[PDB]
Ligand SMILES: CCCc1nc2ccccn2c1Nc1ccc(C(=O)NO)cc1
């Protein structure tokens with residue numbers, strides 16, 4: 001019945017020394033946090049302590065080599081930090097980056113613990129750097145370790161291996177790392193909504209397409225919902241949740257819901273180019289809350305407008321706290337390309353999910 005909230009100031013020590021205005025600013029987690037205090041949402045939450053993820057915990061998803069490299073970044077000269085940053089796609093490294101990644105992963109571990117024990121009902125994690133682009137062996141797109149995947153694996157490790165975990169990635173970018181991490185796995189259902197534009201959008205790969213339904217034992221447990229044809233807003237995400245996310249999720253019957261809650265699909269984002277309003281995010285959160293008896297963890301990922309992300313994640317926290325959902329627009333209809341996308345996903349996943357047939 002109570003909502004946990006984890007946040008640590010120390011996660012701002014990760015920064016870009018060569019570009020001070022690089023959009024993945026440290027203030028992102030602070031600004032959001034301040035909103036939670038000034039809308040008096042923080043007063044109504046149970047503060048969960050941050051902590052450092054152990055290297056054995058990072059081993060749940062990442063190889064020892066990758067861990068050892070990013071760990072070696074801790075004590076490096078700035079020239080070496082640039083040298084190692086250039087070895088990855090869209091990655092800047094600081095001396096403090098490894099610690100901040102450990103803080104994000106550990107914070108989400110403590111949140112998942114407080115949920116799975118019974119301390120809290122649901123929880124929200126205001127963390128950085130993000131994680132869903134990180135893969136088992138490499139760092140990508142502002143991410144070092146996959147916080148969501150590691151939180152699923154840890155949640156299984158403190159309960160049972162077969163624990164059904166639902167990861168819903170509504171960041172505007174595809175979570176390639178989470179997909180590849182759980183591609184052959186049926187215990188973790190991964191569903192992503194992402195701007196695709198037929199590979200023209202980052203991470204610029206055809207792996208984000210609707211036909212990637214998983215591999216072998218994990219076939220059908222990987223739902224890609226790719227958007228094409230310009231800006232999308234509340235109508236399209238609401239329709240994708242109505243016809244795909246919630247039916248498949250209800251058939252899957254998850255026991256823990258992790259939300260890769262990137263807010264770069266929001267209004268006013270310079271990188272996503274979408275117009276999902278904070279009230280729409282509130283409605284998606286409210287819909288996800290009806291699953292897994294309410295056990296939902298909202299992990300911050302992307303989102304590069306301070307006001308947009310503060311308002312949006314504050315709305316999600318309001319829904320987690322039990323407030324009633326604000327009324328939403330009139331939708332009108334959907335961009336035809338979005339209906340075509342939903343129909344493509346439905347055709348791809350109908351053989352695996354009876355509730356789609
Ligand atoms: C904006 C700074 C760097 C940049 N500029 C472009 C232009 C086109 C395509 C990619 N670009 C990237 N790289 C990104 C990697 C990850 C993310 C992400 O994960 N957001 O949540 C966003 C951008």
Ligand SMILES: [K+]
Nearest residue numbers: 169171173193
């Ligand atoms: K996504």
Ligand SMILES: [K+]
Nearest residue numbers: 182185188221
């Ligand atoms: K999967």
Ligand SMILES: [Zn+2]
Nearest residue numbers: 171173262302
């Ligand atoms: Zn993103």
